């Protein structure tokens, strides 16, 4: 199912609306899809657009059929997992066993900041023992999801 809307005004540039997050990603390996679905949760159905102006016009004049959460690419600002945090995680459980979720998906480069928001703030680990070790480490303190779809969140 695609995102549907009424043109908010005349001469509407349809390219300003990218669509549902779920429609914009290509999972690199099907065996990680369960984890990625849990990483994103309801954000799979957030709508990505170019700017806050486009977002505003859709919300006000798009005759949207439900409440939507819109990700405006020019304003979205994730609090990302830092490279040092990943380094520490890799040393803790092994680099084969922990990845930033973002590294598991492909997408058009223009979507980068939106994808950082959805997938750049959560780790994916191979199993529960490692997920717990990573998530709750005082140096890491970051939401972590297992390949089995279990979640560990220090907050």
């Amino acid at each position: 199912l695609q995102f549907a809307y009424k043109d908010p005004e005349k001469n509407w540039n349809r390219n300003s609306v990218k669509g549902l997050v779920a429609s914009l990603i290509n999972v690199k390996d099907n065996s990680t899809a369960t984890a990625l679905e849990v990483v994103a949760g309801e954000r799979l159905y957030n709508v990505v657009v170019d700017t806050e102006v486009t977002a505003k016009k859709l919300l006000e004049k798009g005759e949207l059929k439900r409440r939507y959460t819109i990700i405006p690419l020019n304003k979205i600002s994730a609090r990302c997992i830092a490279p040092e945090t990943l380094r520490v995680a890799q040393n803790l459980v092994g680099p084969d066993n922990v990845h930033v979720a973002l590294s598991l998906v492909d997408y058009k480069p223009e979507l980068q900041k939106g994808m950082e928001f959805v997938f750049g703030t959560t780790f994916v680990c191979n199993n529960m023992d490692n997920a717990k070790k990573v998530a709750f480490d005082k140096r890491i303190m970051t939401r972590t999801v297992t390949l089995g779809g279990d979640v560990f969140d220090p907050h």
Binding site: N46, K65, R67, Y68, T69, I71, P72, I76
Partner: protein, 166 residues
């Protein structure tokens, strides 16, 4: 719901001392802001109790009787906000929801600061966008119509015409 009802009975009976109630029931606000505050503050449904011990007692009670689960705020953990509630400069002098809450109990006021923090209320989405996206500070903003700009920058709304559905 059933959970709040059960907890309130434990309070009224006196079986579990230390229960205050659902946070949103412990303060008041001008009706103008009803949609805004209901849309942006799920912590209004947390149950305020005096202490962590009382919280754990309620958690244990709910589980023992198959009633369900609730989230609790212990006033003992709210004291960290005692010196953090003073008014601050906001974009366009937009109001802070916290400052609009009327409450006489100063401990409960601390709980309201925990729940609302520096969330602002704007008159419409036009103003919300100007206010939220400051260069030096991303503000969380809710409109009078319940639309929300999160600090991340997401913008949420739609189907406002069903807010007052029976």
């Amino acid at each position: 719901g059933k959970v709040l009802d059960a907890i309130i009975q434990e309070k009224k009976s006196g079986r579990i001392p230390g229960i205050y109630g659902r946070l949103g029931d412990l303060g008041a606000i001008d009706e103008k802001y009803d949609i805004a505050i209901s849309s942006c503050c799920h912590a209004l449904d947390y149950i305020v109790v005096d202490s962590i011990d009382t919280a754990q007692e309620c958690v244990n009670f709910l589980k023992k009787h198959n009633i369900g689960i609730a989230t609790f705020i212990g006033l003992d953990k709210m004291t960290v906000w005692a010196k953090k509630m003073s008014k601050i400069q906001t974009p366009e002098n937009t109001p802070r929801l916290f400052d609009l809450v009327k409450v006489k109990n100063e401990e409960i006021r601390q709980a309201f600061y925990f729940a609302l923090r520096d969330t602002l209320v704007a008159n419409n989405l036009d103003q919300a966008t100007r206010v939220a996206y400051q260069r030096d500070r991303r503000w969380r903003v809710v409109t009078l119509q319940g639309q929300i700009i999160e600090q991340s920058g997401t913008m949420s709304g739609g189907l406002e015409h069903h807010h007052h559905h029976h």
